[PDB]
Design a binder for this molecule. Structure first.
Ligand SMILES: Cc1c(-c2ncc(Oc3nccc4occc34)cc2F)n(C)c(=O)[nH]c1=O
Lengths: 282, 57, 339, 238
């Protein structure tokens, strides 16, 4: 009954990803007030990337796992390119979302006078162009495979080079931006609590800091726990050490972040309300 | 003072508004009912109009 | 003296109430009980007008039933072509806090006003082709809340200083002043013959004024809160009011009392605007809960709902031929609905 | 139907010419911040307006660091029951000006200011709007407290049991008596402000004078803080 459980779990994961990201993409077409903000542009870019993960990558790997072999012939190279491109696009969209939030919070006036929708299109285009360049150009030229099923390992040169661009630089940027955001929020909380204390003393704090820590830790921890072990074994393996099953488990862990992305970046009051209007119109 | 002037002005205004002639509510309600009947045909919102002569299609 | 005058006023009020009660024979509901109901009214958004950058506060139809003006809290006064959705004019306003606008029956002028306490007249047909201010009417000591053209040379305005005035646009002087309201006057409605007009103020009362005589002839009470909207029946012998207490009432001039009340149990938001159909059978009202309800004027039954505005419905209007209904809203959009 | 075609072409051309100008106005509208200015006649609200600049509603435009501000004065033959208060439900902030030296003047003018502040704070149309509180005329208040027989405790009995807070930053040359009165009045306003706060709007009190070159910077910085807090709130970080 192990195979039945595995098939059910993989089907549930793919369905969750596809349903959630379709809901996110649909909630923006039905409402024109969400399309007026640029942060929503970045959110829908991330949702599109997650949809491409769920459609072009996940089902074919699950078929090979349930069947026990790769039945798609020469689709391995195109599938590998799709995998790299979609995952990279998701991570770069997350990095751009963090940078946008940091610029909004730290410089509100210059943000309002410089975050025209033209700049958002430039950022999105840069992210997607970087994804396509890192994936399809080296794979078609067979630079990903070592010079001396679809269960191979990347080349030594390509594994570290792609991991640095796709993961480590975006992770560094996100850490910097969210640390600065945390510091700003702490200063504001202290300033608010000082006035509250003055008024209380005239009459006769930890909750907010807990909320800030909860939000930031959820974001960062979900991202890092989903994608970090994969990008460590992605550079350990080409120099080999583990089997081909634990690596598949960590690959699936990395892909499952796209399932959770809608409820972390598109779950505010505006999106939650739009998720109820489209749910039975009640 | 101005208070006595305001009070006397209010009393005078109330005097004029009590001198009007009032018809029965039965007659007034029938007149409005008859107006709607005599003009129900020419109300495009009450009776939907075919798209042949509708200028908002 | 003060006690005597107060007692006299109370006795006069009691006499008026007694006369009104005596003249009441049967309710409007009893008379219109065998009338066949209108059924369900189904209207759809035929047009959507875009171009205003902020909340829309007022709109008005032209007498040709094609052109309409609207006002926004961004200093813009836009004239539309409702058939082709094109914009004919866009007038920048000196003050950004407009709250009313009107269209002249001739079609050569539009009016405007708000928190600046000024009513501005604009010439739409001039030699240069560009719209320029023709007159500024000063004299009110409160915000302009409504204005309505009588002809090309007269206009009646209501203000937040509890006063209505009649103006001569050629000289810019108040010909008549209508006093008697104790709260801020919020709305106006001219009779079909432009011989009388009704106003509704924040003292929860409505008054009927003789334009030439300059005196208040009748006062109507029954609303528990501020009256925000007022509209004459197409006959000219009745009118309807909308208030903050989430109800609409119909008053008869000859009966001198309220006839029908238009309320529902699941309505708690106030009425912003109110209007009638060409036959007078339907009563359309705008609400704070973002949609417009359609009422049967003779049965007080809700015959439909116009939904599709993202924010508060601020203004409302029915064309002179009865073809279409326009609604403006705080979401900065104008929608045109047809049967 | 060539005449109809020409008419439609002219109408489309005029519409396009109109819509070109509406695009620049949209750009100008988004960069501007609207301010509602409240106060009394006896407060130094007029002199502050004159410094900022250097019938009905009065409007003042000024620009700081490429940010455009638009301030509106509603002191035009007004009264209570402010029906027009719903026109300003989407301004950046409210500037409330109080004459702190008018506690003794007559039922007090300071009590009238406190009642007006409490009325404005709890208004249903102003539930997401922050107030920049200008506690004006500090020199006159200092003169009254230092020399004179006008005891503050005579009019406000709670002054007999008030102690200067810990988060007090007196000027180097100020008497300890003057500091206590300033912070007593500030806390009198802050008690109203915090007794009914929603978490969607705050109060930014300042000790000002009518002739100051710092008030514009105060407004700028407080609006910057307001926008930053709104951003932090929309991301569940506040
Ligand atoms: C899973 C898998 C692979 C495979 N694909 C891609 C891969 O690198 C990445 N994945 C996601 C995001 C990324 O960003 C930068 C590099 C990168 C590593 C891999 F091991 N290959 C080659 C195979 O043959 N069979 C398989 O099942």
């Amino acid at each position: 009954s192990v195979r039945i459980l595995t098939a059910c779990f993989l089907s549930l994961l793919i369905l969750s990803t596809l349903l959630g990201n379709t809901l996110v993409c649909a909630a923006v077409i039905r409402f024109r007030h969400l399309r007026s903000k640029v942060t929503n542009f970045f959110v829908i870019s991330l949702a599109v990337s997650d949809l491409l993960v769920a459609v072009l990558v996940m089902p074919w790997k699950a078929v090979a796992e349930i069947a026990g072999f790769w039945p798609f012939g020469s689709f391995c190279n195109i599938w590998v390119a799709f995998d790299i491109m979609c995952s990279t696009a998701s991570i770069l969209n997350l990095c751009v979302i963090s940078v946008d939030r940091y610029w909004a919070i730290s410089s509100p006036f210059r943000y309002e006078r410089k975050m025209t929708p033209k700049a958002a299109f430039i950022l999105i285009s840069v992210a997607w162009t970087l994804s396509v360049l890192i994936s399809f150009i080296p794979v078609q030229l067979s630079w990903h495979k070592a010079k001396p099923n679809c269960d191979s390992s990347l080349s030594r040169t390509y594994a570290i080079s792609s991991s640095v661009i796709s993961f480590y630089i975006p992770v560094a940027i996100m850490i910097v931006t969210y640390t600065r955001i945390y510091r700003i929020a702490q200063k504001q909380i202290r300033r608010i609590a000082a006035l509250e204390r003055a008024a209380v003393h005239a009459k006769n704090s930890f909750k907010r800091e807990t909320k800030v820590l909860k939000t930031l830790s959820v974001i960062m921890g979900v991202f890092v726990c989903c994608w970090l072990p994969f990008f460590i074994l992605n550079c350990i393996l080409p120099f080999c050490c583990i089997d081909s099953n634990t690596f598949d488990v960590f690959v699936w862990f990395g892909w499952a972040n796209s399932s959770l992305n809608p409820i972390i970046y598109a779950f505010n009051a505006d999106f939650r309300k739009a998720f109820s209007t489209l749910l039975g119109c009640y | 003072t101005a208070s006595i002037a305001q009070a006397r002005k209010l009393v005078e205004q109330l005097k004029m508004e009590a001198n009007i002639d009032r018809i029965k509510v039965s007659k007034a309600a029938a007149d409005l009912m008859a107006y709607c009947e005599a003009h129900a045909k020419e109300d495009p919102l009450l009776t939907p109009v075919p798209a042949s002569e509708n200028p908002f299609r | 003296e003060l006690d005597q005058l107060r007692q006299e006023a109370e006795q006069l009020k009691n006499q008026i109430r007694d006369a009104r009660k005596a003249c009441a024979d049967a309710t409007l509901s009893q008379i219109t009980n065998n009338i066949d109901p209108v059924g369900r009214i189904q209207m759809r958004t035929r047009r959507t007008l875009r171009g205003h950058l902020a909340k829309i506060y007022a709109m008005h139809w032209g007498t040709d039933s094609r052109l309409l003006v609207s006002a926004s809290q961004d200093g813009k006064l836009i004239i539309w072509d409702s058939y082709t959705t094109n914009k004919v004019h866009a007038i920048p306003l000196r003050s950004s806090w407009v709250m009313t606008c009107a269209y002249a029956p001739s079609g050569n002028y539009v009016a405007c006003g708000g928190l600046d306490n000024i009513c501005s007249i604009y010439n739409l047909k001039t030699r240069e082709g560009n719209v320029r201010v023709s007159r500024e009417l000063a004299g009110h000591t409160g915000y302009l809340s409504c204005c309505r053209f009588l002809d090309d040379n007269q206009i009646v305005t209501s203000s937040g200083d509890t006063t209505c005035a009649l103006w001569d646009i050629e000289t810019g002087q108040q010909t008549t002043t209508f006093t008697g309201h104790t709260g801020d006057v919020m709305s106006l409605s001219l009779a079909p013959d432009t011989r009388l007009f009704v106003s509704g103020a924040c003292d929860a009362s409505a008054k009927l004024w003789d334009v030439r005589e300059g005196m208040c002839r009748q006062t109507f009470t029954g609303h528990e809160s501020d009256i925000n909207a007022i509209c004459f029946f197409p006959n000219g012998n009745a009118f309807a009011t909308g208030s903050d207490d989430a109800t609409c009432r119909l008053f008869d001039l000859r009966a001198d009392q309220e006839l029908m009340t238009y309320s529902h149990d699941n309505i708690i938001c106030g009425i912003t605007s109110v209007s009638f159909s060409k036959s007078g059978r339907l009563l359309l009202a705008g609400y704070d809960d973002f949609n417009c309800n359609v009422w049967d004027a003779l049965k007080a039954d809700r015959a439909g709902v116009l939904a599709g505005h993202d924010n508060r419905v601020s203004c409302l209007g029915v064309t002179d031929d009865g073809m279409a209904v326009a609604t403006g809203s705080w979401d900065s959009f104008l929608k045109i609905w047809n049967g | 139907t060539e005449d109809q075609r020409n008419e439609e072409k002219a109408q489309r051309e005029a519409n396009k010419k109109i819509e070109k100008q509406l695009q620049k106005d949209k750009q100008v509208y988004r960069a501007t911040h609207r301010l509602l200015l409240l106060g009394a006649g006896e407060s130094g609200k007029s002199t502050i307006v004159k410094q900022m600049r250097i019938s009905g509603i009065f409007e003042t435009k000024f620009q700081v660091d490429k940010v455009n501000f638009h301030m509106f004065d509603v002191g035009a033959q007004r009264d209570e029951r402010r029906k027009w208060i719903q026109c300003f439900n989407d301004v950046t902030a409210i500037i409330f000006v109080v004459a702190s030296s008018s506690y003794n003047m007559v039922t007090n003018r300071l009590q009238e200011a406190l009642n007006l502040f409490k009325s404005i704070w709890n208004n249903r149309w102003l539930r997401t709007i922050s107030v920049i509180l200008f506690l004006n005329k500090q020199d006159l208040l200092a003169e009254k407290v230092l020399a004179g027989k006008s005891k503050i405790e005579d009019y406000f009995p709670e002054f007999a049991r008030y102690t200067t807070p810990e988060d007090a930053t007196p000027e180097p040359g100020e008497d300890p008596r003057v500091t206590r009165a300033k912070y007593f009045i500030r806390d009198e306003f802050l008690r109203i402000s915090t007794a009914s706060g929603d978490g969607r709007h705050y109060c930014y009190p300042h000790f000002t004078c009518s002739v100051d070159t710092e008030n514009i910077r105060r407004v700028f910085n407080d609006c910057r803080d307001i926008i930053q807090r709104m951003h932090l709130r929309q991301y569940e970080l506040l």
